[PDB]
Design an enzyme around this catalytic site. Structure first.
Site, PDB file in Angstrom:
ATOM      1  CG  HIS A 102     -14.282 -25.152 -11.468  1.00  0.00           C
ATOM      2  ND1 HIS A 102     -14.813 -25.675 -12.629  1.00  0.00           N
ATOM      3  CD2 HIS A 102     -13.310 -26.016 -11.082  1.00  0.00           C
ATOM      4  CE1 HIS A 102     -14.207 -26.815 -12.918  1.00  0.00           C
ATOM      5  NE2 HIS A 102     -13.287 -27.042 -11.997  1.00  0.00           N
ATOM      6  N   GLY A 126     -14.134 -33.277 -18.421  1.00  0.00           N
ATOM      7  CA  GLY A 126     -15.249 -33.962 -17.796  1.00  0.00           C
ATOM      8  C   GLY A 126     -14.887 -34.717 -16.538  1.00  0.00           C
ATOM      9  CB  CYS A 168     -13.836 -31.037 -13.114  1.00  0.00           C
ATOM     10  SG  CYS A 168     -12.502 -30.099 -13.910  1.00  0.00           S
TER      11      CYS A 168
END
Ligand code: NA
Length: 299
Positions: free
Chosen positions: A39, A141, A143
């Site tokens: 993503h 941040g 991820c």
């Protein structure tokens, strides 16, 4: 008795920044490949209902900004494996440790190296909840932050963080891209389902308590496995199996306390509570140490 995380240096040297379009998150640079949540190719509007195949096709290798501290990395190949992106690069990571990819089971524990925009910020130990979520600290941040275990010189990578659920709990994949649990990398309401307490972990933590001097919870009673699981289901405890009894073997032998006697002490604990007392300084039952963790820390 403290939650231990694994020493993080071997993973620190693998953390990179990945920016695609305007979205930016953490990746894992091993050999000549960078792994990251797919993503990263999504705008915040894309996340509502992404067609990843369609979205990835708008992207070419030069759309991807992989940076490892200062040296930027030339991307010469991009591929989607389930929910992870695999960015083939020219330079192989000189710091690549010995590593496997493993899919762990619910109840197993692992260390997480939380990173924000590519730099490690902290390390913590946590457990895969029986409902395949993890309760942790993944801020904007984080991820792409990875979960791992370390056996001698080998880094078994087991988790990559993808999403925060509307319930505030966290979800992600193995390093092959398959989510743990019924979750998808889409910004929609997703049910986690009933969580339960990891029963074998609580028993292991009680053995740790006996090893370290806390013994008040040891009972004169005993119990059968069925009677215990009957109490376990009422309190949303995972059913205890014979596999679980076997894994607790070394702890039972080290302490001279049979597993079923320990299960009987846990039974009275569940039915009466702790009555204001603490075990290992905790006013509630800890279920995020596996029997391996307790052994490792008591060894
Ligand atoms: Na507590």
């Amino acid at each position: 008795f403290r939650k231990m995380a694994f020493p993080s240096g071997k993973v620190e040297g693998c953390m990179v920044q990945v920016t695609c379009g305007t979205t930016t998150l953490n990746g894992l640079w091993l050999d000549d490949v960078v792994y990251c949540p797919r993503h990263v190719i999504c705008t915040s509007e894309d996340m509502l209902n992404p067609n990843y195949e369609d979205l990835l096709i708008r992207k070419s290798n030069h759309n991807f900004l992989v940076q490892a501290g200062n040296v930027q990395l030339r991307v010469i190949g991009h591929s989607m494996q389930n929910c992870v992106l695999k960015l083939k690069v020219d330079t192989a990571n000189p710091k690549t440790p010995k590593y496997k990819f493993v899919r762990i089971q619910p109840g197993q524990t692992f260390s997480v190296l939380a990173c924000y925009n590519g730099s490690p910020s902290g390390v913590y130990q946590c457990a895969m909840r029986p409902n395949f979520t993890i309760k942790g600290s993944f801020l904007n941040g984080s991820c792409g932050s990875v979960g791992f275990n370390i056996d001698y010189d080998c880094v078994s990578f087991c988790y990559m963080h993808h999403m925060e659920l509307p319930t505030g709990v966290h979800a992600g994949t193995d390093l092959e891209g398959n989510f743990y649990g019924p979750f998808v990398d889409r910004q929609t309401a997703q049910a986690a389902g009933t969580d339960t307490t990891i029963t074998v972990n609580v028993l292991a933590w009680l053995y740790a308590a006996v090893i370290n001097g806390d013994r008040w919870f040891l009972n004169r009673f005993t119990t059968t496995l069925n009677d215990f699981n009957l109490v376990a289901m009422k309190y949303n405890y995972e059913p205890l199996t014979q596999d679980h009894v076997d894994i607790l073997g070394p702890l039972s032998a080290q302490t001279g306390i049979a597993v079923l006697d320990m299960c009987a002490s846990l039974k009275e604990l569940l039915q009466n509570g702790m009555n204001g007392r603490t075990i290992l300084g905790s006013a509630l039952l800890e279920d995020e140490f596996t029997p391996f963790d307790v052994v490792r820390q008591c060894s």
